[PDB]
Design a protein around this ligand. Structure first.
Ligand SMILES: Nc1ncnc2c1ncn2[C@@H]1O[C@H](COP(=O)(O)OP(=O)(O)O)[C@@H](O)[C@H]1O
Lengths: 50, 51
């Protein structure tokens, strides 16, 4: 909001599963007005998916 | 190699603090960071060969 243009950024969250992690993402999405989307990467081994 | 503890001071005073300052867009007028504060940082919160 201060330095003009939008920038991306990375973050991480951690704790017990089912703590409400995922919910805050969409809540953010409601805050920032950008489109939401999610996808699993657990257990993936091959790189073609990424 | 890695980087010497003292050497990192000379790093952060020139090649690091201004860069992040330009990422946040601030000036020392609103964001001064002395050398001594930096030596305190590395002295306490971060002793790692990478910066
Ligand atoms: N602070 C919170 N506010 C609202 N819902 C919460 C909160 N903490 C936990 N939840 C509840 O936890 C459950 C799991 O949340 P979610 O983050 O979507 O799954 P996961 O924990 O697997 O990411 C949801 O039903 C959610 O309502």
């Amino acid at each position: 909001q201060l330095r003009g243009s939008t920038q991306g950024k990375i973050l991480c969250f951690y704790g017990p599963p089912g703590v409400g992690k995922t919910s805050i993402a969409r809540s953010i999405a409601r805050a920032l007005n950008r489109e939401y989307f999610r996808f699993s990467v657990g257990g993936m081994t091959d790189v073609a998916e990424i | 190699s890695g980087y010497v503890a003292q050497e990192k001071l000379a790093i952060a005073e020139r090649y690091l603090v201004p860069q992040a300052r330009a990422l946040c867009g601030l000036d020392e007028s609103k964001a001064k960071l002395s050398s001594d504060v930096l030596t305190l940082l590395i002295k306490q919160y971060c002793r790692e060969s990478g910066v």
